[PDB]
Design an enzyme around this catalytic site. Structure first.
Site, short mmCIF file in Angstrom:
data_model
loop_
_atom_site.label_atom_id
_atom_site.label_comp_id
_atom_site.label_asym_id
_atom_site.label_seq_id
_atom_site.Cartn_x
_atom_site.Cartn_y
_atom_site.Cartn_z
CD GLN A 19 -1.69 -0.20 3.37
OE1 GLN A 19 -0.82 -0.78 4.06
NE2 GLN A 19 -1.77 1.68 3.81
CB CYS A 25 -4.64 -1.11 5.35
SG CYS A 25 -5.68 0.37 6.57
CD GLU A 86 -3.43 -4.69 -8.24
OE1 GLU A 86 -3.36 -5.04 -6.93
OE2 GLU A 86 -3.95 -2.85 -8.38
CG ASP A 114 -20.27 -7.44 9.52
OD1 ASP A 114 -21.54 -5.98 9.84
OD2 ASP A 114 -20.08 -6.68 8.38
CG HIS A 140 1.18 -1.35 19.89
ND1 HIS A 140 -0.01 -1.34 19.36
CD2 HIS A 140 0.84 -0.58 21.46
CE1 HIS A 140 -0.48 -1.10 20.43
NE2 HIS A 140 -0.20 -1.06 21.36
CG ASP A 162 -3.94 1.76 14.19
OD1 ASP A 162 -3.37 2.24 14.78
OD2 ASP A 162 -3.87 0.15 14.06
CG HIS A 163 -3.45 -1.90 9.46
ND1 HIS A 163 -3.14 -2.33 7.66
CD2 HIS A 163 -2.69 -3.02 9.27
CE1 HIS A 163 -2.43 -2.46 7.32
NE2 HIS A 163 -1.72 -3.57 7.95
CG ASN A 187 0.77 -5.71 7.25
OD1 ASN A 187 -0.22 -5.08 6.62
ND2 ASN A 187 1.38 -5.46 7.47
#
Lengths: 220, 98
Positions: A19, A25, A86, A114, A140, A162-163, A187
């Site tokens: 990214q 993300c 892509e 969900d 962190h 947050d990701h 990731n």
């Protein structure tokens, strides 16, 4: 399926992407989940366009390089009636104008599901559905420096994530402390970071980092 | 907080001021102006493939700017890179992503 699951072995997962400096993300997590669901339904693996999401899914609530949610991306693919590959809509790591072209749509969804906020439900979804999109607290220093073993950060939050990343499986490894179980997580920071771009996140340690708090997958 | 979103604003800390001091040479190069002391006042962070810091700084003649500073991943030695900034800001302007 148990006791270990790794969808990479069955061809459901594309190579790790990057990214870059854009807060996208969420788009990588969503294309990762869609890539696995489209593989399940077509037997073909095609890398999908994060840029298409970054550029076009604002109407669904996303904020381009300033964040977004995997459910919103799934909503966009449903509403738009498709998502470009892509190759046809490359990644630029900056928010640009929407240039979606239906001719190059190679995926689609009807919405999303969900998962209940329990690691047990998440395990059932990974085993039975395929790679799952999840949000985690990755804020962190320990996460920047992750390289091996099972990641555990005592200061991790279970509610403030947050990701957005992608759970591709789960497993175990013998450990000095007997905290042996992990979620296998893809990731979007390139292949050099972590273990080839993946991180084994602690599993069954009270929803460590919130991995089970905002998990979902597209309905194809 | 949403994935890739900015954190809430917090007052600048000495560590944030250090990041501002470290990138000042890059700011002067891109703006072609010199700044003297740029004082960090408030900041937000954002997780990307690495970390972006959005920092409100006070400059001379009481002008403000918002700096975007990318702290690279460990593989790139955590190199600090000034990747964008907004000039002519007001003291109370919100720090928003850009």
């Amino acid at each position: 399926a148990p006791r270990s699951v790794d969808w990479r072995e069955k061809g459901y997962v594309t190579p790790v992407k990057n990214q870059g400096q854009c807060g996208s993300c969420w788009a990588f997590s969503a294309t990762g989940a869609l890539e696995g669901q489209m593989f399940r339904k077509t037997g073909r693996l095609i890398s999908l366009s994060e840029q298409n999401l970054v550029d076009c899914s604002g109407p669904q609530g996303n904020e381009g390089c300033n964040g977004g949610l995997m459910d919103y991306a799934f909503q966009y693919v449903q509403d738009n009636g498709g998502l470009d590959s892509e190759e046809s809509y490359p990644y630029e790591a900056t928010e640009e104008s929407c240039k979606y072209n239906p001719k190059y749509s190679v995926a689609n969804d009807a919405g999303f599901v969900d998962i209940p906020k329990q690691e047990k439900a998440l395990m059932k979804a990974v085993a039975t559905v395929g790679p799952i999109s999840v949000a985690i607290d990755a804020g962190h220093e320990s996460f920047l420096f992750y390289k091996e073993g099972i990641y555990f950060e005592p200061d991790c939050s279970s509610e403030d994530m947050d990701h957005g990343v992608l759970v591709v499986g789960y497993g175990f490894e013998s450990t000095e402390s007997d905290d042996n179980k992990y979620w296998l997580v893809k990731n979007s920071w390139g292949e050099e970071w972590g273990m080839g771009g993946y991180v084994k996140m602690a599993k069954d340690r009270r929803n460590h980092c919130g991995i089970a708090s905002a998990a979902s997958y597209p309905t194809v | 907080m949403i994935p890739g979103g900015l954190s809430e604003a917090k007052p600048a800390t000495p560590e944030i001021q250090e990041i501002v001091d470290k990138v000042k040479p890059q700011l002067e190069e891109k703006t072609n102006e010199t700044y003297g002391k740029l004082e960090a006042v408030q900041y937000k962070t954002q997780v990307v493939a690495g970390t972006n810091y959005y920092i409100k700084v006070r400059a001379g003649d009481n002008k403000y700017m918002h700096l975007k500073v990318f702290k690279s991943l460990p593989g790139q030695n955590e190199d600090l890179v000034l990747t964008g900034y907004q000039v002519d800001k007001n003291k109370d302007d919100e720090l928003t992503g850009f």
